[PDB]
Amino acid sequence: AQSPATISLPQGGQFRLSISNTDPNMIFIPGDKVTAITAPGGMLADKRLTTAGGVLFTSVATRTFTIFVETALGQTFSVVATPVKGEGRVYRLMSAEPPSRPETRKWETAQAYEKLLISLNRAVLTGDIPDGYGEVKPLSDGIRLPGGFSVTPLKAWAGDQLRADRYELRNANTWGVALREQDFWKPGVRAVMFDNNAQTLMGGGRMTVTVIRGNG
Amino acid sequence: AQSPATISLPQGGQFRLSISNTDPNMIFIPGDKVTAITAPGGMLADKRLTTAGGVLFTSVATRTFTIFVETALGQTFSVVATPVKGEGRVYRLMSAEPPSRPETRKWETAQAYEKLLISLNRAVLTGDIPDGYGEVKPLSDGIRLPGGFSVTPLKAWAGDQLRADRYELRNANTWGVALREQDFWKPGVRAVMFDNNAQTLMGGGRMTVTVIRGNG
Amino acid sequence: PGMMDSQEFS
Amino acid sequence: PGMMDSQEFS
Amino acid sequence: VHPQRSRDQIATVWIAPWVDSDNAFHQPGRVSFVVSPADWVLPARV
Amino acid sequence: ATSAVEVPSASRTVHPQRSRDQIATVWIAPWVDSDNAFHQPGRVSFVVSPADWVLPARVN
Amino acid sequence: ATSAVEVPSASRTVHPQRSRDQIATVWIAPWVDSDNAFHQPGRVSFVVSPADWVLPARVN
Amino acid sequence: VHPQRSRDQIATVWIAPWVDSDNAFHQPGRVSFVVSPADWVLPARV
């Protein structure tokens, strides 16, 4: 039914959540696969690593403890659980700092630069994300604001080089302005694309933009 | 959510922190792999190595003691633990001065078409003629004229691609104007250089340009 | 008292 | 009565 | 009455200043490409 | 693997677009298939040249 | 492996410094990549000669 | 508007008098070298 509950969790962060002592739970990471979990303090019943890349567990205690979930790409998080009555839950993890994937390094350095930017841009536009690119938390304030605009991040994809983002531009003003692509530049942005080829908005906020940052 | 507690130590320093007896506690050095440990006085129980490289543990004692920790590169440390009630926590260890390597591999290659244009264009300026290029009669009036100028052909190269040229500019007028090198384009030009780097005109014509062309 | 019912087909 | 708990990983 | 085409779809990228691997500073630029190539429009009236 | 093609700019800011397509229609005279199946084919229309990148001579 | 180069001193105490660099810019005419990708490259600037040691003709 | 360079960094050593390994008194002198070679300055305004 619901969207999975999503959280931030920098490398080795803590987050306060609640789990159910019946109804086995699940924690899964997009872009990776969990290979270890060690959650003493409350002595969970059992652990089972699925094939998607999540981990299934269930507790029977009645007090707060800690759970250490560890990934394969050298990512380590920590969630402070609390057993409750029922209705088993599913959470999503979202590393705010992209990991390192040397396969993606050799894949990226294999080809040229401009064709690489074109590859990433078309993979963002269509939807088919390349193999080797994860999905990391969308960073705020990664672009300039030339005038009264209201940005709202949507999603981000990243690995080892050229982290890619997606934003939204809305004209909070009353008239129509000029959208020059070089206004939304910062020290670190490598490319900017306007999704619909509109030379000037009207006043309604339905314009998105893709930004290809670096050091992802 | 919560960021890890970040601290800075010298080589072999000794930091005063707090750990929790239940709820295993993690310590990890970003960029390194912990190799050893020596944690006496408390006689703590669990000692395992994660995949990130850090080490996590589980104290059982009830007083303040000392725990040492080593690194694959030799950067030893020391932390003075102090067991508390619960809610185990994660810390981060790094040194301040010793990590310093700003060396950057020059990634970002260029296209196959632009590199050869730049190579031939650089060899037409230094003087060293690349293997595979001869000399030809200057093609007549192969470049446009933006008003009161003139052209005085000198010479040209050619061979197997990119029949390069070298023409001459002469301000036949009296005052000074601006320059934008998109005015000299002709149907077939591949690249135009200005040698004497100037963005304004003076009246004296002693600067040359190098117009590259096909069928060479 | 808490184990699961996990199965894999083929 | 005074020995340590020393370990090496890999 | 003739069977026409569909208009193409393009997107123009803006390449921020970057330094070459051969040490040549490349200034901002544009590169354009097509996403959904044109195909015959299927008529709804005959 | 030769030099890439050029796009001649116009003569005295708008992003590029492709050029419109052209279509050719053929009228096939009725025939009889090898298996005795009389055909009345219609006007088949095929594309003859793909679109090419061009710069608009707008008010640049 | 021949004789090293000389630095001609000036003509009638300041420590040496290198000489300023010069830069050349090239304007590439728009082209079309082999995979149908229209390019509008900018002015590429490259270094043509490295700096060389020189003595300043100061008030020595 | 052109992309300039960065100014170099040098350090000049002062070599105190030293007798050679083949008996030849070398008197005080100077040797100079570069530490941080010049690279393109990355613009902050476009």
Author numbering:
A (entry chain Z), B (entry chain a): 24 to 239
C (entry chain Y), D (entry chain d): 177 to 186
E (entry chain c), H (entry chain h): 158 to 203
F (entry chain W), G (entry chain b): 69 to 80, 157 to 204
Extract from the study:
Here, we present the structure of an outer-membrane core complex from the iconic F-T4SS encoded by the E. coli pED208 plasmid solved by single-particle cryo-electron microscopy at 3.3 Å resolution. This 2.1 MDa structure, provides an atomic model of the TraB, TraK and TraV proteins and unveils unique stoichiometry relationships between the three proteins. Surprisingly, the complex is formed by two highly flexible concentric rings made by a total of 69 proteins chains arranged in two distinct symmetries. The components that make up this complex include the proteins TraB, TraK and TraV which are homologous to VirB10, VirB9 and VirB7 respectively and are observed throughout the multi-functional T4SS spectrum.
For the outer ring, thirteen ASUOR heteropentamers made of TraK1, TraK2, TraV1CTD, TraV2CTD and TraBCTD(177-186) (labelled −6 to +6 in the clockwise direction) assemble to form the complete OMCCOR. Unexpectedly, the ASUOR segment of the map revealed densities to build and refine more than one molecule of TraK and TraV. Indeed, densities to fit two NTD and CTD domains of TraK (TraK1 and TraK2) were identified. Similarly, densities corresponding to two TraVCTD (TraV1CTD and TraV2CTD) were also observed in the ASUOR segment. The TraKNTD is made up of nine β strands (β1 – β9) in two sheets making a β sandwich domain arrangement. Two such domains from the respective TraK chains (TraK1 and TraK2) are present in a front-to-back arrangement and extensive salt bridge, hydrogen bond and hydrophobic interactions stabilise their interaction. The TraKCTD is made of two α helices (α1 and α2) and six β strands (β10 – β15). The two TraK CTDs are arranged with TraK1 on top of TraK2 and are related by a P2 symmetry. These two TraK CTDs are held together by two anti-parallel TraV chains that wraps the stem of the TraK linkers (α1 – TraK2 and α2 – TraK1). TraV has four β strands per chain making two continuous β-sheets with TraV1 and TraV2 that stabilise the entire OMCCOR complex. TraB also extends into the outer ring with a short stretch of sequence (residues 177–186) at the N-terminal end of the CTD.
